[PDB]
Symmetry: C6
Subunit: 147 residues, 6 copies
């Protein structure tokens, strides 16, 4: 309904989310239109003034990317771009992309696999920079990670 | 429900066009175009002289969001944060019946999370409280 | 149903709950019969033997008193009388006042405004003395705050 | 459900007329007029010799309440706190099937809260446990 | 449905669970077939490698044994055998005993009485040894308590 | 759902006949006779080089259980713990689509509790992850 979809390009692995939202990768969960992304079912992030950024935290289900993301994590591989695309039901009753969150030069700092979409997986990124854009109303803003 | 307006020293009306179709999609409801909807609030004063805590508000992702996240990373002094609270009147009509206004508030924390929500904390220099229908009010400097 | 209603008289402000449970003050929540009180939707208090009293803690919704109570709190104003009246459904099927809790020379020590009756507000009083009376059965007892 | 009786050294039967119309309004149920209804219980013994914990009971606001709050602020030694537990018998009838009796119990904490409830803690000198239908029993000094 | 039943034999008291699951002892809860046991409605236990055993923890309702178990606890009485019998719905639709847990030379280390089967009671045993047996498939294993 | 196989150095296939009528009664489902059903999983890797956490799995009481509790009290090195994850395929059929395999895993904690459940923790020397339908994989030494 109002899910996010994500893409990862790793310096070593290329597009990590390639063919990752497909019948093969997700099975009965598959919906067309986002075949080279991953279906984000979670999100948490926080910037505070004691600025200090906190790691970005997404949640997905087990998939084609998953074994790759671990490789990423355990390898210490810099992620050239992680880009989170936000979706909503528009005012005219159609699904639309209306917000973007984007990491530049991100690094995966931890992963947790757990069963509760019953097969789950949270992934955490730090990054050198993050950009928030509103896609319909045209507002945008970005910033450099601190601490 | 509540609607909030934020005017900052750099950006002006940060909440301009923030409750429109473009901003919040299907959730749009005419009448509060230059206000962000607030559906969560937290604030506290505790007692020897009183000390203040930050006002926390929860909103959804909208046009204001990136501006807000800017207001926080910049350190921009919010001239006015104004929260108008609505309720169903005794006669059966939505009415604006309360305001909580912060002067020179600052954003000291923002938490985004997932439907797609975002918490905002402000400290400030002065808070005002007014009951619009019964005509009572009070205010206090931050400490 | 089984709500409490309260009255506050402040040394400086007089009857703080005056006209505070009315259409103007509470809106659609209004029920006649308690116009000069406030509708208490919460209560917590505790006396212990390590006697030591703990602050009295009520909960209400935003109202006509609310901006006043803050004035009280931030002013350090001594409350001459806070009096909490307890209501229940009687044995004959009618609502009745059957219990009273009363503070003498109370002081408001903290307030919390929060949205969950969706607009809420907890208020805490210390006091020099508190009296508990059962109104139908005639039992009563009082005591001086300690610590 | 459970019903409790408390006789104190100063007041006598603190729970006299405590489960009547006057005391608990609509919730009244004949048969236990000189007992307060208990709908919450907590107690523990843990093990080198055993130590005791206070018996906690939860009741509603009633005629006993102010007397109880007195018993605590006075320090009055409760000669007897007696808790009789009821259940539905195998034949389909409410029956008294268990007792927990404290001797020289003391009230060491009371928590009132809101439908309108109140927790009571007792320490004591001796607790007895008896199963009324199966005819088993035990008891122990506080330590 | 899938309850456990237990037996206790104490060095001093003999069979502590004798006549303890009966009309007299449990009232309307009574089901025939386990008259000399107790109806276990809880269970918790854990063995870890920092081996170190943790106390065995069962839950029952108030009953004929209960005043006895306290005697046991407060007396420091060694329990010659506590034996927990596990029940399930078989593949052919009939209730069966399929697992056993058994303590040798156990000691009751604490009891908690509490009201939530509304009248409840958790009991904790340490022990010199515990044996786990699967009754249909024939697997078994035992061990000595450590720490 | 998931099914797990465990081969140990002393016992061989610890999960042999562990998902049969004899083992799990009414819950039996043909096709995975030498696998224990896993209906709960927890595992984590966190980041300067990576460190591993134990894989936790939850199962019911079954034929494997006492063997498992032995594997823990003995200290027996598990040659292979293999977890195959199933899902409903896009075409509407249960399919094995993922594996998590531990090499030389050790049981470092077991928690039994009540319908009748049991948690197992393994540390290990090497974990592998493979996506069976999309053909991706990774693995890592414990640290």
């Amino acid at each position: 309904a109002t899910p996010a979809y994500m893409s990862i390009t790793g310096t070593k692995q290329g597009l990590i989310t390639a063919g990752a939202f497909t019948e093969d990768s997700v099975g009965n969960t598959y919906q067309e239109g986002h075949e080279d992304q991953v279906m984000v079912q979670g999100f948490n992030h926080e910037v505070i003034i004691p600025r200090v950024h906190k790691p970005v935290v997404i949640t997905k289900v087990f998939d084609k990317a998953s074994p790759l993301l671990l490789a990423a994590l355990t390898s210490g591989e810099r992620l050239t771009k992680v880009e989170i695309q936000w979706y909503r039901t528009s005012a005219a009753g159609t699904q639309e992309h209306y917000y973007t969150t984007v990491l530049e030069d991100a690094i995966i700092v931890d992963i947790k696999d757990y069963m509760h979409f019953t097969h789950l997986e949270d992934v955490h990124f730090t990054y050198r920079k993050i950009t928030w854009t509103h896609e319909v109303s045209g507002t945008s803003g970005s910033d450099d990670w601190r601490s």
